[PDB]
Amino acid sequence: MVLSEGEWQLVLHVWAKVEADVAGHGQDILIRLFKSHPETLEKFDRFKHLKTEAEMKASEDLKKHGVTVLTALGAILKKKGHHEAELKPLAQSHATKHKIPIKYLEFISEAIIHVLHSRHPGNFGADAQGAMNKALELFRKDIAAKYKELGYQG
Ligand code: HEM
């Protein structure tokens, strides 16, 4: 699939707001993912012991990881589709080391959309959400294809 420049503009415009508070957005997103789909927490041996949302909010470690996730995703989005180099090491670690099924990438995509909708209503109308969903679908499709080449296609 291919996004138009207009679609990328909508995506990068709301992402510029996200970048005003990367740690806060990273936290909200990972917590939303863990509350909505608790099974995903089992993949993080580093966080698997967090029992409540209160514990999650208090975790400095979870917060640092959220920053790592959003910084990596932001670097990919800013490439506007030319992200093959950035995708390679990410696909390799998630397919071979962490073993993250595509289904879980759909779950985090949903969490990202939920949080942007909640925090940025004025910059995340229907068209902007459609563009963000298209950018994340492209990301998932490309990661899925890499998974297959790497022998996982999980
Ligand atoms: C927007 C999608 C995601 C991005 C951009 C992303 C990015 C990253 C980055 C950059 C790292 C550190 C380097 C590495 O190991 O590759 C990482 C580690 C990891 N990721 Fe992801 N990730 C994503 C989704 C997921 C999902 C949905 C899961 C699990 C349900 C997951 C589980 C893990 C685990 C288990 C680690 C290692 C954490 C640790 O022990 O330090 N990732 N991810």
From Swiss-Prot:
O2 binds at H65. Heme b binds at H94. It catalyses: Fe(III)-heme b-[protein] + nitric oxide + H2O = Fe(II)-heme b-[protein] + nitrite + 2 H(+); H2O2 + AH2 = A + 2 H2O. Transmembrane segments: none annotated. Nitrite binds at H65. InterPro entries: Globin, Globin-like_sf, Myoglobin. It is an enzyme of class 1 (oxidoreductase). It comes from the Eukaryota. The modification Phosphoserine is found at S4. Keywords: Cytoplasm, Heme, Iron, Metal-binding, Muscle protein, Oxidoreductase, Oxygen transport, Phosphoprotein, Transport. GO terms for molecular function: heme binding; metal ion binding; nitrite reductase activity; oxygen binding; oxygen carrier activity; peroxidase activity. It is found in: Cytoplasm, Sarcoplasm. Its EC number is 1.7.-.-, 1.11.1.-. The modification Phosphothreonine is found at T68. Residues 2-148 form the Globin domain. Belongs to the globin family. Monomeric heme protein which primary function is to store oxygen and facilitate its diffusion within muscle tissues. Reversibly binds oxygen through a pentacoordinated heme iron and enables its timely and efficient release as needed during periods of heightened demand. Depending on the oxidative conditions of tissues and cells, and in addition to its ability to bind oxygen, it also has a nitrite reductase activity whereby it regulates the production of bioactive nitric oxide. PANTHER family: MYOGLOBIN. Monomeric. This is Myoglobin. The lineage of its organism: Eukaryota, Metazoa, Chordata, Craniata, Vertebrata. The gene is MB.
